[PDB]
Amino acid sequence: CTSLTLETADRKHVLARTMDFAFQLGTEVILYPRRYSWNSEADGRAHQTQYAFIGMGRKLGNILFADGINESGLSCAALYFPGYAEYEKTIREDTVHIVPHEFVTWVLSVCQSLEDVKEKIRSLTIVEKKLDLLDTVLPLHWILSDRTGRNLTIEPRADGLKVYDNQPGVMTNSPDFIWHVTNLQQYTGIRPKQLEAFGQGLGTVGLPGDYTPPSRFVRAVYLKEHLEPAADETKGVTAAFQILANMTIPKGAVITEEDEIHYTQYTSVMCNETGNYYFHHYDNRQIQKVNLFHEDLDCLEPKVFSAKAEESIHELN
Amino acid sequence: CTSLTLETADRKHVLARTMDFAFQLGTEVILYPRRYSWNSEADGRAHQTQYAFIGMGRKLGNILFADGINESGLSCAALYFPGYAEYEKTIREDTVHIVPHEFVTWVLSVCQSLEDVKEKIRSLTIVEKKLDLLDTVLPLHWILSDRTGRNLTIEPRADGLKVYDNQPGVMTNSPDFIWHVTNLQQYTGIRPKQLEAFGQGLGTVGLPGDYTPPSRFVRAVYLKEHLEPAADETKGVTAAFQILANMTIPKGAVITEEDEIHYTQYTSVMCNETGNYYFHHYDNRQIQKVNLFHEDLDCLEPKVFSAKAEESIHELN
Amino acid sequence: CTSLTLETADRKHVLARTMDFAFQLGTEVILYPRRYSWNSEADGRAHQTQYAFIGMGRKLGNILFADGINESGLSCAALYFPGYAEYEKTIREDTVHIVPHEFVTWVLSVCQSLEDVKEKIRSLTIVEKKLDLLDTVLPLHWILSDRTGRNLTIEPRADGLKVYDNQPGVMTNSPDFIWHVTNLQQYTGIRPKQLEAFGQGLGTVGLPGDYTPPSRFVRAVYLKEHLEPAADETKGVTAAFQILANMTIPKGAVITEEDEIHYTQYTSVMCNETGNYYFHHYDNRQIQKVNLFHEDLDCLEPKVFSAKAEESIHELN
Amino acid sequence: CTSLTLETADRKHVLARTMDFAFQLGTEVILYPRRYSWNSEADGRAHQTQYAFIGMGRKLGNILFADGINESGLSCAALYFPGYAEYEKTIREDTVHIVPHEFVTWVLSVCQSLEDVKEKIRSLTIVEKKLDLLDTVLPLHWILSDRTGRNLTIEPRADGLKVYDNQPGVMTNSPDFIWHVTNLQQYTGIRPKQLEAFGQGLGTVGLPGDYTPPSRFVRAVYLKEHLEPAADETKGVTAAFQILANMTIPKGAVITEEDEIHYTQYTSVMCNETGNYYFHHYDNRQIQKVNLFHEDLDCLEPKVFSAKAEESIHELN
């Protein structure tokens, strides 16, 4: 997965991410409403959501989310972090306990901002527990965004939960966040204009083209840094998709250790100010959209907005 | 520009191309009908079209085409070829004379197949003449496709018009076609599966990521060669777009000598068997489609199918 | 600079390094004898050497060493580490205080092995103090070796002296050691034999060619990992030079921010077991050698072995 | 193999080359005297040498040369050119016939300059014939130099002997010469000084590091283009070795299809004006020299100057 934030000329923010995976997740955009009672798989204890939100989710016992945007402008995305993610084995105490795949639900339901996350996260404990559908502990890390325009990355390490100001506003997968930010120093020579002619693009030589996390990180940062400013929310959504097109894996390009096809299943963009969640997916290019605020946020139960599944083609004749 | 052919499991062919440029071309899909009389800018002599077709075009005196698919399955795309394209200065005789920006119109209107092109092209002469809108001679070369599944590339050189079997079924810009095909030998090590773990993609290391023509050529060939087979026309169109997403230039990424923004304005896919022309453009992700055969091909004049210009967003609520 | 250890088949060990700089250092190989009194620029306090050693140095008040090999088989090399080196600003107490440029003298004069290093270093303080010649505090980090065949890299950080087991037996410059070892994971696909014909070397595609520190680190690990075993000392010394030839900077190839030419001035190889110091420099390819043990190690004063400066040419006729 | 010419400030010229192979060639520097009779493996016909020369060769019936420098300042080197070399299968007439491995002997024995080459070659036929030792027809191409400072590369193709002015003064192996010169256009952004801090060398990012022929060609052009001027012959010879250090293959780094180790066996530098042949080999770094003119150039038979085989170490104590 590749994620990035962008800021438009009229001052909105979006958080955008591709979801690259071999197993089919079958996520759909879902409203998780306010005052919704759920029980953690860490210890069975009950929680009650405070803020409503929408994001890509799947009912697996509770409804687990890969990302989402809440009613107060906080947005979050969970991306794979294999080999680096390390959780608590032993249940602490005087802490809330959740499992890794609950963090999105937690943070979006209980926090209203980045300041808020930085504070509540001090009494949280994420513990090592499998996701049955996969029979494995999800190795994850998270990128978050709110209406101040700041960005965080949060990474569950052996040393505990680490929080970073994410200045580039980009994040992919392993290794750890400082590693990637340091790696950017190798790439400050790539630039849009040639120095002083098969065609255009020569300044761009050295941009990594492969699908490894470090290269996708560098290629996102390059394209974000030289993006012509986008005027408004819609133009921002387009740009985030244009950039993420460059990190879209066609089926067949990448094969896992198990002979599975690792490809981009969906790409989404979430707008912090407007509560809009846009997306397309491998099989349908047309942007789809859910507006959080058209819904009854005191709804009694989750609401699913199911997607158009095939290529939506506009016939001119 | 990046172009490529693909073949689906049910045996259709598509020819796909991005159109990367700094100046706004304002092309629209247009039907050029059968028996349509036009006069060449080479010498003023009259021609009469034999085959109807559709492609991206612009009225500039006559309607000039950047690509197109005709009523008998021949498809063609003109891509920039700067510094390498060389035309006839002196008007020969016993030949048809056209200017570079007429080749698409010519070949699509007068030829019914690749065999046919290879034969008619022997009595053709392309002469050096400007395109007024640009006050410059277009340096171009062409990729063509028909229902046999073969592909050609044709390149106007100092030595005359050169014709190549295009075995990879890919073409970008300069330098010449054999140069790129030879350059592919450097890249046969890139592969979808790692040898024997920040994540996926490690076999893919070395894939060029920059926007130069040679790198776009290599990156297209890689993605075409490892594309999981596409089952039918629609799935083929999706795949061609998924591959070309990887060669889509966001505004700002690439700047010309003149400080202009060189970006991908539109991407199209043309199906040889069905006469369908699909496309999207920088500002609207949704595929748009014109079916050649729904039209009256004996129409008296060109017909324009003008495109939806803004982002067509499907609202789920 | 690039440094690396090697093991020969007869189980000797060598530590090797190029010295890349813009300022002409003018090091010569010097013997520092045992029981030699000196005083630290840190605080003026007395030191008495315990172990004799040889290495490239220069008299600049006391005699400053870039590297060396001692009588009991410990070797060390100091390499530039700009932006990351961080020393103690304030004098602690109950500790031995030295300045950065005295580390090599200290460690080699006082320690008899890597174990001995890991223990004495626990009560060392390195303090921020300028080298006068250059009017700057040297940013440095160190690689060390002994007769056990283990290796260490020691890096002065904000948080204190960090000590790492150096498994690859390679170090260049910035960034920090764990950064580099982590970065090697992107390069595990590079390999001597092609997969399945311009010539040889296609498996090697991807090896970094530039002179930046991360690139030279990866290229040294590749070459060392795949070196055929060297039978003995001489062969070990040859091999080390053959590898480091690949990270040798000719004059003009790299230019600093101040417009100075930054180039490889000398290359040395030290054998741990035999106290042999071999080198060559930019202007004389022939290997030159100093045998620590041929000298009186109790000598009252340091002894300089000045290099043949010109290309030493063997004339066959 | 990698080869390159250099010009010194005092206007001497050198032609330099590494010899990379898997089979041990066992060349020694040999003087081929003037007025020496030999017969071609092509047809048994008589030849009488006109100009004495020295170069690395081996007695294999006649004495076969990989390179050399003649008495009137012409230099040549033969380098592998697999897949692209194409000789004459049938014996022509009114032409001098030779086999591939006799080119160096022929050109150097009979031609006094590059002009003289371009003229005599008009009536040369190179015929397909095996070298027995290897049971294969050598695929070869050649770079040449004289006292004018011009350079040529000559490549045996399907279509005849092609002769090119070699502006860069560099040649490696396959593919063809114009291929490489064209490929240099992708690399014009590489440069000694950074744009606007792990260390030095950031402008150099992008220089190819692998051992394939196109990569070594680009790396040699970069280094030669940016070499500081060498004051005189000796300095020229040093510089040539410093450059070619960067294309020096240690044992194990590259492995052939047959599982043989392909490594740099020797490196030579020939000065055109002075008939000086310098070299070193894998096992002995010290430069060794043969002075063509110290010999009797009318000598009745060839004379071998056998190399110091072991590392020649200069002992300072």
Coordinates of N, CA and C in Angstrom, one line a residue, chain B residues 144-312:
Chain B
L144 N 0.8 0.5 -35.5 CA -0.4 0.0 -36.1 C -0.7 -1.4 -35.7
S145 N -1.9 -1.8 -35.9 CA -2.5 -3.1 -35.3 C -3.7 -3.4 -36.2
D146 N -4.0 -4.7 -36.4 CA -5.3 -5.1 -37.1 C -5.8 -6.4 -36.5
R147 N -6.7 -7.0 -37.2 CA -7.4 -8.2 -36.6 C -6.6 -9.5 -36.7
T148 N -5.5 -9.5 -37.4 CA -4.6 -10.7 -37.4 C -3.8 -10.8 -36.1
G149 N -3.7 -9.7 -35.4 CA -3.0 -9.7 -34.1 C -1.5 -9.3 -34.3
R150 N -1.1 -9.1 -35.6 CA 0.3 -8.5 -35.8 C 0.4 -7.0 -35.4
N151 N 1.6 -6.5 -35.3 CA 1.7 -5.1 -34.9 C 2.8 -4.5 -35.8
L152 N 2.7 -3.3 -36.3 CA 3.8 -2.7 -37.0 C 4.2 -1.4 -36.3
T153 N 5.4 -1.0 -36.5 CA 5.9 0.3 -36.2 C 6.5 0.8 -37.5
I154 N 6.2 2.1 -37.8 CA 6.6 2.7 -39.0 C 7.3 4.0 -38.6
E155 N 8.5 4.3 -39.1 CA 9.3 5.4 -38.6 C 9.9 6.2 -39.8
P156 N 9.6 7.5 -39.9 CA 10.1 8.2 -41.1 C 11.5 8.6 -40.9
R157 N 12.4 8.0 -41.6 CA 13.9 8.2 -41.3 C 14.5 8.9 -42.6
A158 N 15.8 9.4 -42.4 CA 16.5 10.0 -43.5 C 16.6 9.1 -44.7
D159 N 16.7 7.8 -44.5 CA 16.8 6.8 -45.5 C 15.5 6.4 -46.1
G160 N 14.4 7.1 -45.8 CA 13.0 6.7 -46.2 C 12.2 6.1 -45.0
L161 N 11.0 5.6 -45.3 CA 10.0 5.2 -44.4 C 10.4 3.8 -44.0
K162 N 10.6 3.5 -42.7 CA 11.0 2.2 -42.3 C 9.9 1.5 -41.6
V163 N 9.7 0.2 -41.9 CA 8.7 -0.6 -41.4 C 9.3 -1.8 -40.5
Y164 N 8.7 -2.0 -39.4 CA 9.2 -3.0 -38.4 C 8.0 -3.9 -38.0
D165 N 8.2 -5.2 -38.0 CA 7.4 -6.0 -37.1 C 7.6 -5.5 -35.6
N166 N 6.6 -5.1 -34.9 CA 6.8 -4.7 -33.5 C 6.3 -5.9 -32.7
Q167 N 7.3 -6.7 -32.3 CA 7.1 -8.0 -31.6 C 6.6 -7.7 -30.1
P168 N 7.3 -6.8 -29.4 CA 6.8 -6.6 -28.1 C 5.4 -5.9 -28.1
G169 N 5.0 -5.2 -29.2 CA 3.8 -4.5 -29.3 C 3.8 -3.3 -28.3
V170 N 5.0 -2.7 -28.2 CA 5.0 -1.5 -27.4 C 5.8 -0.4 -28.3
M171 N 5.5 0.8 -28.0 CA 6.2 1.9 -28.6 C 6.1 3.2 -27.8
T172 N 7.2 3.9 -27.6 CA 7.1 5.3 -27.0 C 7.6 6.4 -28.0
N173 N 8.8 6.9 -27.7 CA 9.2 8.0 -28.5 C 10.6 7.7 -28.9
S174 N 11.5 8.7 -29.0 CA 12.8 8.5 -29.5 C 13.6 7.8 -28.5
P175 N 14.7 7.1 -28.9 CA 15.2 7.0 -30.3 C 14.5 5.9 -31.1
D176 N 15.2 5.4 -32.1 CA 14.5 4.6 -33.1 C 14.1 3.2 -32.6
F177 N 13.2 2.5 -33.3 CA 12.5 1.4 -32.7 C 13.6 0.2 -32.4
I178 N 14.6 0.0 -33.3 CA 15.5 -1.1 -32.9 C 16.4 -0.9 -31.7
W179 N 16.6 0.4 -31.4 CA 17.4 0.9 -30.2 C 16.6 0.4 -29.0
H180 N 15.3 0.6 -28.9 CA 14.5 0.3 -27.7 C 14.4 -1.2 -27.6
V181 N 14.2 -1.9 -28.7 CA 14.1 -3.3 -28.6 C 15.4 -3.9 -28.2
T182 N 16.6 -3.3 -28.6 CA 17.9 -3.8 -28.1 C 18.0 -3.5 -26.6
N183 N 17.6 -2.4 -26.2 CA 17.7 -1.9 -24.8 C 16.9 -2.9 -23.9
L184 N 15.9 -3.6 -24.4 CA 15.2 -4.6 -23.6 C 16.1 -5.6 -23.1
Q185 N 17.1 -6.1 -23.8 CA 18.1 -7.0 -23.3 C 18.7 -6.6 -21.9
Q186 N 18.8 -5.3 -21.6 CA 19.3 -5.0 -20.3 C 18.4 -5.4 -19.1
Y187 N 17.1 -5.7 -19.4 CA 16.1 -5.7 -18.4 C 15.4 -7.0 -18.1
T188 N 16.0 -8.1 -18.7 CA 15.3 -9.4 -18.7 C 15.4 -10.0 -17.2
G189 N 16.2 -9.4 -16.3 CA 16.2 -9.9 -14.9 C 15.0 -9.4 -14.1
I190 N 14.2 -8.4 -14.5 CA 13.2 -7.9 -13.6 C 12.1 -9.0 -13.6
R191 N 11.6 -9.4 -12.4 CA 10.6 -10.4 -12.5 C 9.6 -10.3 -11.3
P192 N 8.4 -10.8 -11.4 CA 7.3 -10.6 -10.5 C 7.6 -11.3 -9.1
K193 N 8.3 -12.4 -9.1 CA 8.5 -13.1 -7.9 C 10.0 -12.9 -7.4
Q194 N 10.1 -12.6 -6.1 CA 11.5 -12.6 -5.6 C 12.2 -14.0 -5.7
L195 N 13.5 -13.9 -6.1 CA 14.5 -15.0 -6.1 C 14.4 -16.2 -5.0
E196 N 14.6 -15.9 -3.7 CA 14.1 -16.7 -2.6 C 13.8 -15.9 -1.3
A197 N 12.6 -8.9 3.0 CA 11.1 -8.8 3.1 C 10.5 -7.6 3.8
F198 N 10.8 -6.4 3.3 CA 10.0 -5.2 3.7 C 8.6 -5.3 3.2
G199 N 8.4 -6.2 2.3 CA 7.1 -6.5 1.7 C 7.1 -7.3 0.4
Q200 N 6.2 -7.0 -0.5 CA 6.2 -7.6 -1.8 C 7.1 -6.9 -2.7
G201 N 7.3 -7.3 -4.0 CA 7.9 -6.5 -5.1 C 9.4 -6.7 -5.3
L202 N 10.1 -7.3 -4.4 CA 11.6 -7.3 -4.6 C 12.1 -7.8 -6.0
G203 N 11.4 -8.7 -6.6 CA 11.9 -9.2 -7.9 C 11.8 -8.1 -8.9
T204 N 11.2 -7.0 -8.6 CA 10.7 -6.0 -9.5 C 11.8 -4.9 -9.5
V205 N 12.7 -5.0 -8.5 CA 13.8 -4.0 -8.4 C 14.5 -3.9 -9.7
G206 N 14.8 -2.7 -10.2 CA 15.4 -2.3 -11.4 C 14.5 -1.8 -12.5
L207 N 13.2 -2.2 -12.4 CA 12.2 -1.5 -13.3 C 12.4 0.1 -13.3
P208 N 12.7 0.7 -14.4 CA 13.0 2.2 -14.5 C 11.7 2.9 -14.1
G209 N 11.8 4.0 -13.2 CA 10.6 4.7 -12.8 C 10.5 6.1 -13.5
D210 N 11.4 6.5 -14.3 CA 11.4 7.9 -14.7 C 10.5 8.1 -16.0
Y211 N 10.3 9.3 -16.4 CA 9.4 9.5 -17.6 C 10.0 9.7 -19.0
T212 N 11.3 9.5 -19.1 CA 11.9 9.3 -20.4 C 11.4 8.2 -21.2
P213 N 11.4 8.5 -22.5 CA 10.9 7.5 -23.5 C 11.4 6.0 -23.3
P214 N 12.8 5.9 -23.2 CA 13.4 4.5 -23.0 C 12.8 3.8 -21.8
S215 N 12.6 4.6 -20.7 CA 12.2 3.9 -19.4 C 10.7 3.6 -19.5
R216 N 10.0 4.5 -20.2 CA 8.5 4.2 -20.3 C 8.4 2.9 -21.1
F217 N 9.3 2.7 -22.2 CA 9.2 1.6 -23.1 C 9.4 0.3 -22.3
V218 N 10.4 0.4 -21.4 CA 10.8 -0.8 -20.7 C 9.7 -1.2 -19.7
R219 N 9.2 -0.2 -19.0 CA 8.2 -0.4 -18.0 C 7.0 -0.9 -18.7
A220 N 6.7 -0.4 -19.9 CA 5.4 -1.0 -20.5 C 5.6 -2.5 -20.9
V221 N 6.8 -2.8 -21.4 CA 7.1 -4.2 -21.8 C 7.0 -5.1 -20.6
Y222 N 7.7 -4.6 -19.5 CA 7.6 -5.5 -18.3 C 6.1 -5.8 -17.9
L223 N 5.2 -4.7 -17.9 CA 3.9 -4.9 -17.3 C 3.1 -5.7 -18.3
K224 N 3.2 -5.4 -19.6 CA 2.5 -6.2 -20.6 C 2.9 -7.8 -20.4
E225 N 4.2 -8.0 -20.4 CA 4.7 -9.4 -20.3 C 4.2 -10.2 -19.1
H226 N 4.0 -9.6 -18.0 CA 3.6 -10.3 -16.9 C 2.1 -10.0 -16.5
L227 N 1.4 -9.4 -17.5 CA -0.1 -9.2 -17.2 C -0.9 -10.6 -17.1
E228 N -1.5 -10.9 -16.0 CA -2.5 -12.0 -16.0 C -3.4 -11.8 -17.2
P229 N -3.7 -12.9 -17.9 CA -4.6 -12.8 -19.1 C -5.9 -12.1 -18.9
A230 N -6.3 -11.3 -19.8 CA -7.6 -10.6 -19.6 C -8.7 -11.3 -20.4
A231 N -9.8 -11.7 -19.8 CA -10.8 -12.7 -20.4 C -11.5 -12.2 -21.6
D232 N -11.8 -10.9 -21.7 CA -12.7 -10.4 -22.8 C -12.4 -8.9 -23.0
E233 N -13.0 -8.3 -24.0 CA -12.8 -6.9 -24.5 C -12.9 -6.0 -23.3
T234 N -13.9 -6.0 -22.4 CA -13.9 -5.1 -21.3 C -12.7 -5.2 -20.3
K235 N -12.4 -6.5 -20.0 CA -11.3 -6.7 -19.1 C -9.9 -6.3 -19.7
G236 N -9.9 -6.4 -21.0 CA -8.7 -6.0 -21.8 C -8.5 -4.5 -21.7
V237 N -9.6 -3.7 -21.8 CA -9.6 -2.3 -21.8 C -9.1 -1.8 -20.4
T238 N -9.7 -2.5 -19.3 CA -9.3 -2.2 -18.0 C -7.8 -2.4 -17.8
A239 N -7.3 -3.6 -18.2 CA -5.9 -3.9 -18.0 C -5.1 -2.8 -18.8
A240 N -5.4 -2.4 -20.0 CA -4.5 -1.5 -20.8 C -4.5 -0.2 -20.0
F241 N -5.5 0.1 -19.3 CA -5.6 1.4 -18.5 C -4.8 1.2 -17.2
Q242 N -4.9 0.0 -16.6 CA -4.1 -0.3 -15.4 C -2.6 -0.2 -15.8
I243 N -2.2 -0.7 -16.9 CA -0.8 -0.7 -17.3 C -0.4 0.8 -17.5
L244 N -1.2 1.5 -18.3 CA -0.8 2.9 -18.7 C -1.0 3.8 -17.5
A245 N -1.6 3.4 -16.4 CA -1.6 4.2 -15.2 C -0.1 4.4 -14.7
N246 N 0.7 3.4 -15.0 CA 2.0 3.4 -14.5 C 2.9 4.3 -15.3
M247 N 2.4 4.9 -16.4 CA 3.1 5.9 -17.3 C 2.3 7.2 -17.4
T248 N 1.5 7.5 -16.4 CA 0.7 8.7 -16.3 C 1.4 9.8 -15.6
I249 N 1.6 10.9 -16.2 CA 2.5 12.0 -15.7 C 1.5 13.0 -15.1
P250 N 1.5 13.2 -13.7 CA 0.7 14.2 -13.1 C 1.2 15.7 -13.4
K251 N 0.4 16.7 -13.3 CA 0.9 18.0 -13.7 C 2.0 18.4 -12.7
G252 N 3.1 18.8 -13.3 CA 4.2 19.3 -12.4 C 5.3 18.3 -12.4
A253 N 5.1 17.1 -12.6 CA 6.2 16.1 -12.5 C 7.2 16.3 -13.6
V254 N 6.8 16.8 -14.7 CA 7.8 17.0 -15.9 C 7.6 18.4 -16.5
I255 N 8.7 19.1 -16.7 CA 8.7 20.5 -17.2 C 9.6 20.6 -18.4
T256 N 9.1 21.2 -19.4 CA 9.9 21.3 -20.7 C 11.0 22.4 -20.6
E257 N 11.8 22.5 -21.6 CA 12.8 23.6 -21.8 C 12.2 24.9 -21.8
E258 N 10.9 25.0 -22.1 CA 10.3 26.3 -22.2 C 9.5 26.6 -20.9
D259 N 9.7 25.8 -19.8 CA 8.9 26.0 -18.6 C 7.4 25.6 -18.6
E260 N 7.1 24.7 -19.6 CA 5.7 24.3 -19.7 C 5.6 22.9 -19.0
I261 N 4.4 22.5 -18.6 CA 4.1 21.4 -17.9 C 3.7 20.4 -18.9
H262 N 4.5 19.3 -18.9 CA 4.3 18.2 -19.8 C 3.5 17.1 -19.0
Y263 N 2.2 16.8 -19.4 CA 1.4 15.9 -18.6 C 0.6 15.0 -19.4
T264 N 0.0 14.0 -18.9 CA -0.9 13.0 -19.7 C -2.3 13.6 -19.8
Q265 N -2.7 14.0 -21.0 CA -3.9 14.8 -21.2 C -5.1 13.8 -21.4
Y266 N -4.9 12.7 -22.2 CA -5.8 11.6 -22.4 C -5.2 10.2 -22.6
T267 N -5.9 9.2 -22.3 CA -5.5 7.8 -22.5 C -6.6 7.1 -23.3
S268 N -6.2 6.4 -24.4 CA -7.3 5.7 -25.1 C -7.0 4.3 -25.4
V269 N -8.0 3.5 -25.6 CA -7.8 2.1 -26.0 C -8.8 1.8 -27.1
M270 N -8.3 1.2 -28.2 CA -9.1 0.9 -29.4 C -9.2 -0.6 -29.6
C271 N -10.3 -1.1 -29.9 CA -10.5 -2.6 -30.0 C -10.6 -3.0 -31.5
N272 N -9.6 -3.7 -32.0 CA -9.6 -4.0 -33.5 C -10.9 -4.7 -34.0
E273 N -11.4 -5.7 -33.3 CA -12.5 -6.5 -33.7 C -13.8 -5.8 -33.6
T274 N -14.0 -5.0 -32.6 CA -15.3 -4.4 -32.3 C -15.4 -2.9 -32.8
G275 N -14.4 -2.3 -33.2 CA -14.5 -0.9 -33.7 C -14.8 0.0 -32.4
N276 N -14.7 -0.5 -31.2 CA -14.9 0.4 -30.1 C -13.7 1.3 -29.7
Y277 N -13.9 2.6 -29.4 CA -12.8 3.4 -29.0 C -13.1 3.9 -27.5
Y278 N -12.3 3.5 -26.6 CA -12.5 3.9 -25.2 C -11.5 5.0 -24.7
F279 N -11.8 5.8 -23.8 CA -10.9 6.8 -23.4 C -11.2 7.4 -22.0
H280 N -10.2 7.8 -21.3 CA -10.5 8.8 -20.2 C -9.5 10.0 -20.4
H281 N -9.6 11.0 -19.5 CA -8.6 12.1 -19.7 C -8.3 12.7 -18.3
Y282 N -7.3 13.6 -18.2 CA -6.7 13.9 -17.0 C -7.7 14.2 -16.0
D283 N -8.7 15.0 -16.4 CA -9.7 15.4 -15.5 C -11.0 14.5 -15.3
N284 N -11.0 13.3 -15.9 CA -12.2 12.5 -15.7 C -11.8 11.1 -15.9
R285 N -11.8 10.4 -14.8 CA -11.4 9.0 -14.7 C -12.3 8.0 -15.4
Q286 N -13.6 8.4 -15.6 CA -14.6 7.4 -16.0 C -14.4 7.0 -17.5
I287 N -14.3 5.7 -17.9 CA -14.1 5.4 -19.2 C -15.3 6.0 -20.1
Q288 N -14.9 6.6 -21.3 CA -15.9 7.0 -22.2 C -15.7 6.1 -23.5
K289 N -16.8 6.0 -24.2 CA -16.8 5.1 -25.3 C -17.6 5.5 -26.5
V290 N -16.9 5.4 -27.7 CA -17.7 5.5 -29.0 C -17.6 4.2 -29.7
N291 N -18.8 3.8 -30.2 CA -18.8 2.6 -31.0 C -18.9 3.0 -32.5
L292 N -17.8 2.6 -33.3 CA -17.8 3.1 -34.7 C -19.1 2.6 -35.4
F293 N -19.5 1.4 -35.1 CA -20.4 0.8 -36.0 C -21.9 1.2 -35.7
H294 N -22.2 2.0 -34.7 CA -23.5 2.4 -34.5 C -23.7 3.6 -35.4
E295 N -22.7 4.0 -36.2 CA -22.9 5.3 -36.9 C -23.3 5.0 -38.4
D296 N -23.8 6.0 -39.1 CA -24.0 5.9 -40.5 C -22.6 6.1 -41.2
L297 N -22.0 5.1 -41.7 CA -20.6 5.2 -42.1 C -20.5 6.0 -43.5
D298 N -21.7 6.1 -44.1 CA -21.8 6.9 -45.4 C -22.3 8.3 -45.1
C299 N -22.4 8.7 -43.8 CA -22.5 10.1 -43.5 C -21.8 11.1 -44.4
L300 N -22.3 12.3 -44.5 CA -21.9 13.3 -45.5 C -20.7 14.1 -44.9
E301 N -20.7 14.2 -43.6 CA -19.7 14.9 -43.0 C -19.2 14.4 -41.6
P302 N -18.1 14.9 -41.1 CA -17.6 14.3 -39.8 C -18.5 14.6 -38.7
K303 N -18.5 13.7 -37.8 CA -19.4 13.8 -36.6 C -18.4 13.8 -35.4
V304 N -18.7 14.7 -34.4 CA -17.8 14.9 -33.3 C -18.5 14.3 -32.1
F305 N -17.9 13.5 -31.2 CA -18.6 13.0 -30.0 C -18.0 13.7 -28.8
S306 N -18.6 14.7 -28.3 CA -17.8 15.5 -27.3 C -17.9 14.9 -25.9
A307 N -16.8 15.0 -25.2 CA -16.6 14.3 -24.0 C -17.2 15.0 -22.8
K308 N -17.6 14.2 -21.8 CA -17.8 14.7 -20.4 C -16.4 15.3 -19.9
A309 N -16.4 16.5 -19.6 CA -15.1 17.2 -19.2 C -14.7 17.2 -17.7
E310 N -15.7 17.0 -16.8 CA -15.3 17.0 -15.4 C -15.4 15.6 -14.9
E311 N -15.0 15.5 -13.6 CA -14.8 14.2 -13.0 C -16.2 13.7 -12.8
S312 N -16.5 12.6 -13.4 CA -17.8 12.0 -13.3 C -17.9 11.1 -12.0

